[PDB]
Each structure stands twice: as structure tokens, then as C-alpha cells.
């Protein structure tokens with residue numbers, strides 16, 4: 001029996017179905033009082049919320065769902081008709097994420113795809129009828145942020161103005177991605193200093209807006 005399952009169970013035992021805020025609060029409580037987990041957390045989550053509200057994206061892609069905390073956070077702020085696609089390679093996590101979103105009442109706004117980003121990304125246009133993405137949240141293995149950003153561009157999924165938002169650019173860090181976007185004339189970057197989830201350790205988010213080829 002796993003930490004991720006215990007988080008889901010705590011949410012089901014404690015939170016209110018159909019109430020996304022209650023779900024986020026239950027997770028944050030569990031992870032503060034019982035067992036730490038790598039959810040984006042409330043400190044960085046508040047920055048995410050502010051970014052999402054500012055840009056009002058119609059189509060968001062998330063890479064790495066884990067237990068669905070960030071999916072709940074984002075989906076709850078989407079305008080009617082806007083959608084989130086989230087990719088999660090681990091089948092157990094994909095199931096936890098789906099159940100988390102079901103419990104929150106957000107399942108109508110989110111599609112959880114169980115597979116590898118590098119396999120699914122090239123299918124988005126043909127199989128999922130995507131044109132371009134308005135926002136991308138990166139929170140999967142940190143060494144895959146750069147390879148997947150480059151793949152998104154190759155597949156024609158980025159447009160002028162697409163907002164990339166990357167977790168953990170300080171800890172654990174994503175040094176190739178961060179150096180790449182900050183050095184590239186095709187991205188305009190902003191750093192949001194914050195704290196590692198549930199810890200008094202500095203971390204941050206990077207926002208990188210695609211400028212076109």
C-alpha cells in the first residue's frame with residue numbers, strides 16, 4: 001500500500017466531493033502533518049493560480065500528473081469550455097489522478113492520458129484534434145523538460161504567445177532547460193521565487209513565453 005494511495009484515501013475520508021478547494025486543502029494537510037509528497041503545493045500553487053487567471057488559457061497541457069494536485073488546481077480556474085490535457089506515464093498515478101479529479105467534480109474539464117509524453121505529444125494533432133497549446137505546465141522528470149519542449153516545437157504545438165510554466169527550476173532543478181530558455185531569443189522568461197512544497201527551502205517557477213521561430 002503506497003503513499004499515493006494513502007493521499008487519495010485521506011482525501012476521500014476527509015474532503016467534500018465536488019469541492020476542489022476542499023480537495024487541495026486535504027492534500028496539503030496530509031502532506032504537512034503526515035507524509036511529504038511532491039505535489040506542487042500551496043506556495044507555488046498560489047503563483048500558478050495567479051498565472052492561470054492572468055492568461056485565461058483555453059487549452060492547457062500538463063506533463064506529469066502524479067496524484068492530480070496541480071490538475072485540480074488548474075482545472076478549477078478554467079473558463080467554461082476550456083480544457084486541460086494531462087499526461088502521466090505511471091499507470092497507478094494516472095488512476096489516482098483520474099479518481100482525484102472525479103472526486104473534485106472536475107472530470108468534465110480534464111483528459112488524463114496514461115502514456116509517455118514523448119509518445120503522446122506527436123499524436124495530439126491527429127488523434128486529439130489539437131491545433132496549438134495556450135499553456136504548458138512542466139512537472140515530470142526534470143531531465144525531460146528540455147527534450148519535451150523541443151518536441152512540442154517540432155510538432156507544431158507551440159504558437160506565438162504559448163506560455164510554458166515549469167516547476168522545480170531551483171530544486172531539484174532543471175539546468176539544461178533553464179539555461180536553454182533563458183538563452184533563447186524564442187522565449188521571454190520570468191522567474192517566480194517561492195518555496196518547495198511543504199518545506200522551508202527556496203524553489204521557483206519559470207514562465208517562458210514562446211516567441212515563434
Ligand SMILES: CCCNc1ncnc2c1ncn2[C@@H]1O[C@H](/C=C/CNC(=O)c2cc(-c3ccc(F)cc3)cc(O)c2O)[C@H](C)[C@H]1O
Nearest residue numbers: 038064065066087088089090115116117139140141144172
Ligand atoms: C522518460 C518519460 C518522460 N515522459 C513522461 N510522460 C508522462 N509522465 C511522466 C513522464 N516522466 C515522468 N512522468 C510522471 O511525472 C511524475 C514525476 C515527477 C517528477 N517530479 C520530481 O521528481 C519532483 C521532485 C521533488 C523533490 C524535491 C526535493 C527533494 F528532496 C525530493 C524531491 C519536488 C517536485 O516538485 C518534483 O516535481 C510522475 C511521478 C511520473 O510518472
Ligand SMILES: [Cl-]
Nearest residue numbers: 039040069070
Ligand atoms: Cl502536483
Ligand SMILES: [Cl-]
Nearest residue numbers: 041042043198
Ligand atoms: Cl506549500
Ligand SMILES: [Mg+2]
Nearest residue numbers: 040139167168
Ligand atoms: Mg514538482
